[PDB]
């Protein structure tokens, strides 16, 4: 490939990183990270645990 | 596809009543039918 410093913007190389999302018939297991709140205790609250 | 594995450990078929606790729910999603013990052959 033409990676000449002297290049022009669109001819420079560049970093290309392709994510693929494969969803199967198998348990899923990389799920996104879960936010949690804090803990209220002795009083009526909406809770999920 | 859920590979659950329950074990327990008795001190001493014997007589008396033991509960098995989960140890291990691996998500292999695989298809099992058969299965095969495999041992350790010490040279020494
Ligand atoms: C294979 O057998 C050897 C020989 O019996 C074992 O080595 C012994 O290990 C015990 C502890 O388990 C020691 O008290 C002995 O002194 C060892 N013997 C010698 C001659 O070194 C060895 O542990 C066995 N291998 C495995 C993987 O259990």
Do not use: M, W
Not at chain 2, 4 to 14: A, E, G, N, R
Request: with cysteine.
């Amino acid at each position: 490939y033409g990676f000449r410093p002297t290049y022009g913007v669109g001819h420079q190389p560049y970093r290309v990183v392709v994510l693929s999302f494969e969803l199967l018939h198998a348990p899923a297991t990389v799920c996104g990270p879960k936010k949690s709140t804090n803990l209220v205790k002795n009083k009526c609250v909406n809770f999920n645990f | 596809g859920y590979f659950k594995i329950y074990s327990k450990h008795t001190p001493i078929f014997p007589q008396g009543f033991s509960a098995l606790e989960p140890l291990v729910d691996l998500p292999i999603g695989i298809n099992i039918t058969r299965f095969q013990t495999l041992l350790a052959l010490n040279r020494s």
